[PDB]
Amino acid sequence: LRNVPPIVFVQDKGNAALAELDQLLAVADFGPRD
RNA sequence: ACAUUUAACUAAAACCCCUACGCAUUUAUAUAGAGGAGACAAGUAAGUGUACUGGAAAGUGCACUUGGACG
Ligand SMILES: [Mg+2]
């Protein structure tokens, strides 16, 4: 790009929620074949 | 281009040329028409030179500058 504005690095907060939900769904009991 | 006569027992008389200027030359004024300047009135950074496109506004190509940015 001919001109790039200042770059700010922001932490992506949303992905952590999905990661935690996945680490929980891994160990969950859902019932008999359902 | 153009030319020395009379007179002279004291001394005098006589004297007269033709060519230029124009459909030339210089500057100026008036006038058809055309065109300017001024006044009034109301994301691609920025430039220089040059070139093309476009009715314009502008866009793009090549080289150059920081009189920009890069915590
Ligand atoms: Mg140019």
Nearest nt (C1') from A6 Cα:
B71
* PDB resolution in Å: 2.4
Q: Is A32 left (phi over 0), alpha (psi -120 to 50) or beta?
A: beta
Element spanning A22, H or E: helix A14-25
CA A16 from centroid of its chain's CA atoms: 4
| Gap from CA of A2 to ligand 1 centroid (Å) | 18
Q: How far apart are CA A7 and CA A17, in angstroms?
A: 25
Question: Experimental technique used?
Answer: cryo-EM
